[PDB]
Protein backbone atom coordinates (compact mmCIF):
# COMPACT_ATOMS: atom_id res chain seq x y z
CA UNK A 1 0.00 0.00 0.00
CA UNK A 2 1.12 3.53 -0.82
CA UNK A 3 2.89 5.34 2.00
CA UNK A 4 3.49 9.07 2.38
CA UNK A 5 6.91 10.17 3.63
CA UNK A 6 7.87 13.47 5.24
CA UNK A 7 11.53 13.96 4.31
CA UNK A 8 13.64 16.31 6.41
CA UNK A 9 16.47 17.56 4.22
CA UNK A 10 19.38 19.57 5.67
CA UNK A 11 21.93 21.13 3.31
CA UNK A 12 22.72 24.73 2.33
CA UNK A 13 23.48 23.97 -1.35
CA UNK A 14 21.07 23.68 -4.26
CA UNK A 15 23.36 21.05 -5.69
CA UNK A 16 25.41 18.58 -3.67
CA UNK A 17 25.61 14.85 -3.12
CA UNK A 18 22.90 15.08 -0.45
CA UNK A 19 20.55 16.54 -3.06
CA UNK A 20 21.38 13.62 -5.36
CA UNK A 21 20.60 11.26 -2.48
CA UNK A 22 17.24 13.01 -2.09
CA UNK A 23 16.62 12.60 -5.83
CA UNK A 24 17.56 8.89 -5.71
CA UNK A 25 15.42 8.17 -2.65
CA UNK A 26 12.36 9.92 -4.11
CA UNK A 27 12.98 8.11 -7.41
CA UNK A 28 12.73 4.81 -5.53
CA UNK A 29 9.63 6.01 -3.71
CA UNK A 30 7.98 6.90 -7.02
CA UNK A 31 8.81 3.49 -8.52
CA UNK A 32 7.02 1.83 -5.58
CA UNK A 33 4.09 4.24 -5.79
CA UNK A 34 4.84 6.06 -2.55
CA UNK A 35 4.65 9.83 -2.15
CA UNK A 36 6.69 12.34 -0.19
CA UNK A 37 6.92 15.93 0.88
CA UNK A 38 10.13 17.72 1.72
CA UNK A 39 11.12 19.91 4.63
CA UNK A 40 14.07 21.66 3.00
CA UNK A 41 15.13 23.33 6.22
CA UNK A 42 17.67 25.76 4.76
CA UNK A 43 15.35 26.84 1.94
CA UNK A 44 12.49 27.26 4.43
CA UNK A 45 14.73 29.44 6.59
CA UNK A 46 13.68 27.18 9.46
CA UNK A 47 14.67 28.66 12.83
CA UNK A 48 16.98 26.17 14.50
CA UNK A 49 17.56 27.70 17.94
CA UNK A 50 15.24 26.83 20.82
CA UNK A 51 14.29 30.23 22.30
CA UNK A 52 14.05 31.21 25.97
CA UNK A 53 10.25 31.15 25.67
CA UNK A 54 10.22 27.69 24.10
CA UNK A 55 12.71 26.39 26.68
CA UNK A 56 10.54 27.61 29.56
CA UNK A 57 7.53 25.99 27.91
CA UNK A 58 9.37 22.67 27.52
CA UNK A 59 10.61 22.71 31.13
CA UNK A 60 7.10 23.47 32.41
CA UNK A 61 6.00 20.05 31.11
CA UNK A 62 2.52 21.20 30.16
CA UNK A 63 1.36 19.13 27.19
CA UNK A 64 -1.38 21.62 26.30
CA UNK A 65 0.89 24.68 26.23
CA UNK A 66 1.11 26.69 22.98
CA UNK A 67 3.69 26.00 20.27
CA UNK A 68 5.06 28.46 17.69
CA UNK A 69 3.41 28.38 14.24
CA UNK A 70 6.43 26.84 12.52
CA UNK A 71 6.45 23.92 14.97
CA UNK A 72 2.68 23.49 14.57
CA UNK A 73 3.25 23.27 10.81
CA UNK A 74 5.94 20.63 11.29
CA UNK A 75 3.54 18.60 13.43
CA UNK A 76 0.89 18.83 10.70
CA UNK A 77 3.42 17.55 8.15
CA UNK A 78 4.33 14.61 10.40
CA UNK A 79 0.62 13.94 10.95
CA UNK A 80 0.12 13.42 7.21
CA UNK A 81 3.04 10.98 7.09
CA UNK A 82 3.26 7.22 7.49
CA UNK A 83 7.06 7.46 7.40
CA UNK A 84 9.84 9.97 8.08
CA UNK A 85 13.13 10.31 6.29
CA UNK A 86 16.25 12.27 7.19
CA UNK A 87 18.79 13.17 4.51
CA UNK A 88 21.92 15.10 5.50
CA UNK A 89 25.71 15.10 5.46
CA UNK A 90 27.58 13.94 8.56
CA UNK A 91 29.15 17.08 10.09
CA UNK A 92 31.30 16.59 13.20
CA UNK A 93 29.75 13.16 13.75
CA UNK A 94 26.12 14.29 13.92
CA UNK A 95 23.50 16.21 11.86
CA UNK A 96 24.08 19.76 10.65
CA UNK A 97 23.07 22.29 13.30
CA UNK A 98 19.96 23.12 11.26
CA UNK A 99 18.60 19.58 11.62
CA UNK A 100 19.72 19.28 15.24
CA UNK A 101 17.63 22.36 15.93
CA UNK A 102 14.65 20.74 14.26
CA UNK A 103 14.81 17.99 16.88
CA UNK A 104 15.32 20.51 19.69
CA UNK A 105 12.29 22.54 18.63
CA UNK A 106 9.92 19.97 17.09
CA UNK A 107 10.26 17.08 19.53
CA UNK A 108 8.08 18.87 22.08
CA UNK A 109 6.79 17.83 25.49
CA UNK A 110 3.34 16.31 25.11
CA UNK A 111 4.05 15.43 21.50
CA UNK A 112 7.32 13.52 21.15
CA UNK A 113 7.42 12.56 24.82
CA UNK A 114 5.34 13.04 27.96
CA UNK A 115 4.84 11.62 31.45
CA UNK A 116 6.72 8.16 29.19
CA UNK A 117 4.31 8.18 26.21
CA UNK A 118 4.01 9.71 22.70
CA UNK A 119 1.65 11.13 20.08
CA UNK A 120 3.92 10.44 17.11
CA UNK A 121 2.26 7.90 14.81
CA UNK A 122 5.01 6.87 12.39
CA UNK A 123 5.52 3.33 11.07
CA UNK A 124 9.06 3.78 9.75
CA UNK A 125 11.96 6.22 9.66
CA UNK A 126 14.79 6.07 7.14
CA UNK A 127 18.08 7.85 7.76
CA UNK A 128 20.31 8.47 4.74
CA UNK A 129 23.49 10.10 5.95
CA UNK A 130 26.43 10.75 3.64
CA UNK A 131 29.91 10.86 5.14
CA UNK A 132 33.45 11.48 3.96
CA UNK A 133 34.75 8.61 6.07
CA UNK A 134 33.98 5.03 5.07
CA UNK A 135 31.55 2.97 7.13
CA UNK A 136 34.49 0.80 8.17
CA UNK A 137 36.32 3.82 9.55
CA UNK A 138 33.21 5.18 11.28
CA UNK A 139 32.71 1.84 13.02
CA UNK A 140 36.29 1.90 14.31
CA UNK A 141 35.94 5.35 15.86
CA UNK A 142 32.66 4.40 17.53
CA UNK A 143 30.90 6.97 15.36
CA UNK A 144 28.66 4.47 13.53
CA UNK A 145 27.57 3.14 16.91
CA UNK A 146 26.94 6.67 18.21
CA UNK A 147 24.69 7.33 15.20
CA UNK A 148 22.66 4.19 15.87
CA UNK A 149 22.42 5.10 19.55
CA UNK A 150 21.65 8.79 19.17
CA UNK A 151 19.84 9.14 15.85
CA UNK A 152 18.07 5.79 15.49
CA UNK A 153 17.74 5.09 19.20
CA UNK A 154 17.17 8.29 21.15
CA UNK A 155 15.64 10.53 18.45
CA UNK A 156 13.52 8.03 16.55
CA UNK A 157 12.76 4.73 18.32
CA UNK A 158 12.88 6.70 21.58
CA UNK A 159 9.96 8.91 20.56
CA UNK A 160 7.78 6.07 19.27
CA UNK A 161 8.81 5.52 15.65
CA UNK A 162 7.95 1.86 15.16
CA UNK A 163 10.77 0.78 12.84
CA UNK A 164 14.03 2.41 11.77
CA UNK A 165 16.75 1.88 9.20
CA UNK A 166 19.91 3.77 8.35
CA UNK A 167 22.26 3.82 5.40
CA UNK A 168 25.60 5.44 6.08
CA UNK A 169 26.60 6.53 2.57
CA UNK A 170 30.32 6.77 3.21
CA UNK A 171 33.49 7.53 1.29
CA UNK A 172 32.21 10.86 -0.04
CA UNK A 173 35.41 12.92 0.23
CA UNK A 174 35.86 15.97 -2.06
CA UNK A 175 36.87 15.12 -5.62
CA UNK A 176 36.31 11.37 -5.22
CA UNK A 177 33.26 9.91 -6.98
CA UNK A 178 34.17 6.24 -6.45
CA UNK A 179 31.35 5.56 -3.95
CA UNK A 180 28.81 7.78 -5.67
CA UNK A 181 26.95 5.25 -7.81
CA UNK A 182 26.84 2.52 -5.17
CA UNK A 183 25.56 5.00 -2.58
CA UNK A 184 22.86 6.32 -4.89
CA UNK A 185 21.69 2.73 -5.51
CA UNK A 186 21.35 2.25 -1.75
CA UNK A 187 19.24 5.40 -1.58
CA UNK A 188 17.00 4.24 -4.47
CA UNK A 189 16.58 0.86 -2.82
CA UNK A 190 15.66 2.50 0.48
CA UNK A 191 12.79 4.34 -1.23
CA UNK A 192 11.64 1.39 -3.30
CA UNK A 193 11.66 -0.83 -0.21
CA UNK A 194 9.99 1.57 2.24
CA UNK A 195 6.99 -0.68 2.94
CA UNK A 196 9.11 -3.59 4.17
CA UNK A 197 10.46 -3.86 7.73
CA UNK A 198 11.04 -6.28 10.64
CA UNK A 199 8.38 -8.04 12.71
CA UNK B 1 50.78 27.53 36.27
CA UNK B 2 47.83 29.84 35.70
CA UNK B 3 45.86 28.88 32.61
CA UNK B 4 43.45 30.88 30.52
CA UNK B 5 40.20 29.18 29.54
CA UNK B 6 37.87 30.08 26.70
CA UNK B 7 34.46 28.87 27.83
CA UNK B 8 31.74 28.19 25.28
CA UNK B 9 28.36 28.49 26.97
CA UNK B 10 25.21 27.36 25.17
CA UNK B 11 21.79 28.05 26.72
CA UNK B 12 18.95 30.41 25.76
CA UNK B 13 17.75 31.18 29.28
CA UNK B 14 18.95 33.98 31.55
CA UNK B 15 18.45 31.55 34.42
CA UNK B 16 19.01 27.80 34.16
CA UNK B 17 21.04 25.13 35.88
CA UNK B 18 23.67 25.46 33.14
CA UNK B 19 24.17 29.09 34.18
CA UNK B 20 24.83 27.97 37.77
CA UNK B 21 27.24 25.37 36.38
CA UNK B 22 29.10 28.19 34.62
CA UNK B 23 29.20 30.14 37.88
CA UNK B 24 30.49 27.12 39.82
CA UNK B 25 33.15 26.34 37.20
CA UNK B 26 34.39 29.94 37.10
CA UNK B 27 34.56 30.00 40.91
CA UNK B 28 36.85 26.97 40.80
CA UNK B 29 38.98 28.52 38.05
CA UNK B 30 39.43 31.70 40.10
CA UNK B 31 40.17 29.66 43.26
CA UNK B 32 43.03 27.99 41.38
CA UNK B 33 44.41 31.22 39.92
CA UNK B 34 43.19 30.55 36.39
CA UNK B 35 41.64 33.16 34.08
CA UNK B 36 38.80 32.94 31.58
CA UNK B 37 36.61 34.47 28.88
CA UNK B 38 33.01 33.38 28.35
CA UNK B 39 31.51 33.04 24.89
CA UNK B 40 27.78 33.09 25.63
CA UNK B 41 26.67 32.00 22.18
CA UNK B 42 23.02 33.00 22.60
CA UNK B 43 23.94 36.44 23.99
CA UNK B 44 26.35 36.85 21.09
CA UNK B 45 23.59 36.20 18.56
CA UNK B 46 26.04 33.67 17.14
CA UNK B 47 25.07 32.45 13.69
CA UNK B 48 24.88 28.69 13.96
CA UNK B 49 24.11 27.74 10.33
CA UNK B 50 27.01 26.95 8.02
CA UNK B 51 26.05 29.02 4.96
CA UNK B 52 26.34 28.02 1.30
CA UNK B 53 29.35 30.32 0.93
CA UNK B 54 31.13 28.84 3.96
CA UNK B 55 30.26 25.33 2.77
CA UNK B 56 31.90 25.92 -0.60
CA UNK B 57 34.98 27.26 1.16
CA UNK B 58 35.23 24.20 3.41
CA UNK B 59 34.74 21.71 0.55
CA UNK B 60 37.41 23.48 -1.49
CA UNK B 61 39.97 22.55 1.18
CA UNK B 62 42.12 25.64 0.76
CA UNK B 63 43.75 26.49 4.10
CA UNK B 64 44.44 30.10 3.11
CA UNK B 65 40.93 31.01 1.95
CA UNK B 66 38.94 33.80 3.73
CA UNK B 67 36.95 33.22 6.92
CA UNK B 68 33.89 35.13 8.19
CA UNK B 69 34.67 37.81 10.79
CA UNK B 70 32.77 36.04 13.57
CA UNK B 71 34.76 32.85 13.00
CA UNK B 72 38.03 34.82 12.96
CA UNK B 73 37.08 36.29 16.34
CA UNK B 74 36.47 32.81 17.76
CA UNK B 75 39.90 31.72 16.54
CA UNK B 76 41.46 34.72 18.31
CA UNK B 77 39.64 33.84 21.54
CA UNK B 78 40.85 30.24 21.31
CA UNK B 79 44.34 31.51 20.50
CA UNK B 80 44.53 33.39 23.82
CA UNK B 81 43.57 30.23 25.71
CA UNK B 82 45.46 27.29 27.17
CA UNK B 83 42.19 25.42 27.73
CA UNK B 84 38.64 25.27 26.39
CA UNK B 85 35.44 24.48 28.22
CA UNK B 86 32.00 23.60 26.92
CA UNK B 87 28.98 24.08 29.16
CA UNK B 88 25.54 23.10 27.88
CA UNK B 89 22.40 21.05 28.56
CA UNK B 90 21.99 17.64 26.92
CA UNK B 91 19.31 17.95 24.23
CA UNK B 92 18.43 14.83 22.22
CA UNK B 93 21.72 13.27 23.25
CA UNK B 94 24.01 15.97 21.84
CA UNK B 95 24.66 19.65 22.38
CA UNK B 96 22.13 22.38 21.58
CA UNK B 97 21.97 23.29 17.90
CA UNK B 98 23.62 26.61 18.78
CA UNK B 99 26.78 24.84 19.96
CA UNK B 100 26.66 22.23 17.19
CA UNK B 101 26.71 25.10 14.73
CA UNK B 102 29.73 26.55 16.49
CA UNK B 103 31.62 23.34 15.65
CA UNK B 104 30.28 23.33 12.07
CA UNK B 105 31.40 26.93 11.49
CA UNK B 106 34.46 27.34 13.70
CA UNK B 107 36.27 24.04 13.13
CA UNK B 108 37.43 25.14 9.67
CA UNK B 109 39.67 23.51 7.10
CA UNK B 110 43.24 24.69 7.59
CA UNK B 111 42.61 25.39 11.27
CA UNK B 112 40.94 22.45 13.05
CA UNK B 113 41.99 19.87 10.46
CA UNK B 114 43.87 19.53 7.18
CA UNK B 115 47.46 18.21 11.08
CA UNK B 116 45.95 21.02 13.14
CA UNK B 117 46.62 24.63 14.16
CA UNK B 118 44.73 24.32 17.43
CA UNK B 119 47.06 24.66 20.43
CA UNK B 120 45.02 23.67 23.48
CA UNK B 121 46.29 21.64 26.43
CA UNK B 122 42.91 20.67 27.90
CA UNK B 123 39.20 20.77 27.17
CA UNK B 124 36.55 20.29 29.86
CA UNK B 125 32.95 19.40 28.99
CA UNK B 126 30.29 20.06 31.61
CA UNK B 127 27.05 18.58 30.31
CA UNK B 128 23.86 18.82 32.35
CA UNK B 129 21.36 16.02 31.71
CA UNK B 130 17.89 15.00 32.83
CA UNK B 131 18.91 11.34 32.89
CA UNK B 132 21.40 10.18 35.49
CA UNK B 133 24.91 9.41 34.28
CA UNK B 134 24.20 5.86 35.42
CA UNK B 135 21.23 5.55 33.06
CA UNK B 136 23.21 7.16 30.22
CA UNK B 137 26.17 4.83 30.82
CA UNK B 138 23.74 1.93 30.88
CA UNK B 139 22.04 2.78 27.58
CA UNK B 140 25.15 3.59 25.54
CA UNK B 141 24.43 7.31 25.26
CA UNK B 142 27.33 8.34 27.55
CA UNK B 143 29.74 6.32 25.38
CA UNK B 144 28.29 7.86 22.21
CA UNK B 145 28.80 11.31 23.65
CA UNK B 146 32.40 10.52 24.55
CA UNK B 147 33.04 9.23 21.00
CA UNK B 148 31.48 12.29 19.40
CA UNK B 149 32.39 15.20 21.66
CA UNK B 150 35.64 14.03 23.26
CA UNK B 151 36.83 11.86 20.39
CA UNK B 152 35.96 13.55 17.11
CA UNK B 153 35.29 17.15 18.10
CA UNK B 154 38.11 17.65 20.61
CA UNK B 155 40.88 15.05 20.56
CA UNK B 156 40.21 14.78 16.81
CA UNK B 157 41.20 18.40 16.21
CA UNK B 158 44.33 18.34 18.35
CA UNK B 159 43.19 19.12 21.90
CA UNK B 160 45.81 17.33 24.01
CA UNK B 161 43.72 16.22 27.00
CA UNK B 162 39.95 15.98 27.53
CA UNK B 163 37.52 15.46 30.42
CA UNK B 164 33.73 15.17 30.39
CA UNK B 165 31.45 15.46 33.42
CA UNK B 166 27.88 14.30 32.96
CA UNK B 167 25.95 16.33 35.51
CA UNK B 168 22.85 14.15 35.52
CA UNK B 169 19.54 13.87 37.35
CA UNK B 170 18.37 17.36 36.47
CA UNK B 171 14.72 16.64 35.74
CA UNK B 172 12.18 19.49 36.03
CA UNK B 173 11.03 20.10 39.61
CA UNK B 174 13.79 17.99 41.15
CA UNK B 175 16.74 19.74 42.84
CA UNK B 176 18.06 16.51 44.40
CA UNK B 177 21.27 16.38 42.32
CA UNK B 178 21.80 20.12 42.11
CA UNK B 179 24.27 20.66 44.96
CA UNK B 180 26.45 17.66 44.16
CA UNK B 181 26.63 18.60 40.49
CA UNK B 182 27.67 22.18 41.30
CA UNK B 183 30.35 20.73 43.59
CA UNK B 184 31.62 18.70 40.62
CA UNK B 185 31.59 21.74 38.34
CA UNK B 186 33.55 23.81 40.86
CA UNK B 187 36.03 20.95 41.33
CA UNK B 188 36.56 20.75 37.57
CA UNK B 189 37.63 24.39 37.55
CA UNK B 190 39.85 24.07 40.62
CA UNK B 191 41.50 20.93 39.20
CA UNK B 192 41.98 22.25 35.67
CA UNK B 193 45.77 21.85 35.78
CA UNK B 194 45.57 18.17 36.71
CA UNK B 195 46.93 16.01 33.91
CA UNK B 196 48.54 12.62 33.47
CA UNK B 197 52.32 12.36 32.98
CA UNK B 198 54.80 9.50 32.49
CA UNK B 199 55.40 7.75 35.83
C1 LIG C 1 31.67 21.03 8.18
C2 LIG C 1 31.87 19.61 7.78
C3 LIG C 1 31.98 18.62 8.75
C4 LIG C 1 32.15 17.29 8.37
N1 LIG C 1 32.27 16.31 9.33
C5 LIG C 1 32.43 14.99 8.95
C6 LIG C 1 32.53 13.98 9.91
O1 LIG C 1 32.48 14.25 11.10
N2 LIG C 1 32.69 12.67 9.51
C7 LIG C 1 32.74 12.34 8.18
O2 LIG C 1 32.89 11.16 7.86
N3 LIG C 1 32.64 13.33 7.21
C8 LIG C 1 32.48 14.64 7.61
N4 LIG C 1 32.39 15.63 6.65
C9 LIG C 1 32.40 15.21 5.21
C10 LIG C 1 30.93 15.21 4.77
O3 LIG C 1 30.14 14.22 5.42
C11 LIG C 1 30.83 15.06 3.27
O4 LIG C 1 31.40 16.22 2.69
C12 LIG C 1 29.38 14.97 2.85
O5 LIG C 1 28.85 13.70 3.16
C13 LIG C 1 29.24 15.22 1.36
O6 LIG C 1 27.88 15.45 1.09
P1 LIG C 1 27.47 16.80 0.34
O7 LIG C 1 28.10 16.83 -1.04
O8 LIG C 1 25.96 16.82 0.26
O9 LIG C 1 27.98 17.98 1.12
C14 LIG C 1 32.21 16.95 7.02
C15 LIG C 1 32.10 17.95 6.06
C16 LIG C 1 31.93 19.28 6.43
C17 LIG C 1 31.81 20.35 5.38
C1 LIG D 1 14.68 20.13 24.27
C2 LIG D 1 15.24 19.28 25.37
C3 LIG D 1 15.88 18.08 25.08
C4 LIG D 1 16.42 17.29 26.10
N1 LIG D 1 17.04 16.10 25.79
C5 LIG D 1 17.59 15.33 26.80
C6 LIG D 1 18.24 14.13 26.51
O1 LIG D 1 18.36 13.74 25.35
N2 LIG D 1 18.77 13.37 27.53
C7 LIG D 1 18.66 13.79 28.84
O2 LIG D 1 19.13 13.11 29.74
N3 LIG D 1 18.02 14.98 29.14
C8 LIG D 1 17.49 15.74 28.12
N4 LIG D 1 16.85 16.92 28.43
C9 LIG D 1 16.78 17.35 29.86
C10 LIG D 1 17.87 18.43 30.00
O3 LIG D 1 19.17 17.91 29.84
C11 LIG D 1 17.69 19.21 31.29
O4 LIG D 1 16.53 20.01 31.12
C12 LIG D 1 18.90 20.11 31.55
O5 LIG D 1 20.06 19.36 31.84
C13 LIG D 1 18.64 21.07 32.70
O6 LIG D 1 19.67 22.03 32.65
P1 LIG D 1 19.30 23.55 32.28
O7 LIG D 1 18.45 24.09 33.41
O8 LIG D 1 20.57 24.36 32.16
O9 LIG D 1 18.50 23.55 31.00
C14 LIG D 1 16.32 17.71 27.42
C15 LIG D 1 15.67 18.91 27.71
C16 LIG D 1 15.14 19.70 26.70
C17 LIG D 1 14.45 20.99 27.03
Class computed from helices, strands and strand pairing of chain A: alpha/beta
Shape of chain A: globular
| Overall CATH architecture of chain A | 3-Layer(aba) Sandwich
Radius of gyration of chain A: 17 Å
Distance between the termini of chain A: 17 Å
Beta strand count of chain A: 5
Helix content of chain A: 25-40%
**What is the makeup of the main sheet of chain A?**
5 strands, parallel
CATH superfamily of chain A: Flavodoxin domain
PDB class: oxidoreductase
Keywords: flavodoxin-like/fold, FMN, NAD
Assembly: dimeric
Entry title: NAD(P)H:quinone oxidoreductase from Methanothermobacter marburgensis
How are the SSEs placed, and which strands pair?
2 copies of one chain form a homodimer.
Chain A: E1 4-9, H1 17-32, E2 35-40, H2 52-60, H3 69-80, E3 83-89, H4 97-106, E4 124-130, H5 135-140, H6 143-154, E5 164-169, H7 180-192
Parallel strand pairs in A: 1-2, 1-3, 3-4, 4-5
Domain Flavodoxin-like fold (chain A): 3-176
InterPro entries (chain A): Flavodoxin_fold, Flavoprotein-like_sf, NAD(P)H_dehydrogenase_qn
Binding site for FMN (chain A): 11, 17-18, 55, 90, 92-93, 130, 132-133
